[PDB]
């Protein structure tokens, strides 16, 4: 019945660390997509000027 102080009630940290990693990777992926948009822009300028 030991369910709430050092056995069975640390699920909050489970989902909160999952969401904290979700936010860390959302920032990382948003910066990565900023880089991807920059790469798309460079390729777009290169290819359009080639055309």
């Amino acid at each position: 019945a030991r369910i709430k102080d050092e056995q069975k009630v640390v699920t909050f940290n489970k989902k909160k660390l999952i969401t904290y990693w979700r936010k860390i990777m959302r920032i990382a992926k948003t910066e990565q997509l900023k880089n991807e948009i920059d790469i798309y822009s460079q390729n777009n300028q290169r290819e359009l000027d080639s055309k």
Binding site: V9, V10, T11, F12, K14, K15, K16
Partner: peptide, 8 residues
């Protein structure tokens, strides 16, 4: 939903 109700 309850998964996470626990630690903080």
């Amino acid at each position: 939903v309850m998964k996470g109700y626990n630690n903080f």
